[PDB]
Amino acid sequence: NECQNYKRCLEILEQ
Amino acid sequence: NECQNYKRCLEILEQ
Amino acid sequence: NECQNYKRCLEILEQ
What we know:
The structure is a homotrimer. By secondary structure, chain A is mainly alpha-helical. The relative contact order of chain A is 0.24. Chain A has one helix at residues 4-13. Chains in contact: A-B, A-C, B-C. The A-B interface holds A 5-6, 8-10, 12-13, 15 and B 1, 3, 6-7, 10.
C-alpha cells in the first residue's frame, strides 16, 4: 500500500 | 474516509 | 484491527 489515507489523516490532524 | 482507525492507532501508540 | 499499515507508514514517514 501507498499510505495515502495515512498521509491525509496526518495532514488533517497534524499529529 | 473518517480516519477512525488512524486515530485509534495514534491514541494507542502515542505517535 | 492490528495497526500494521499505520505502523509501516509511521516508520517510513517518520511522523
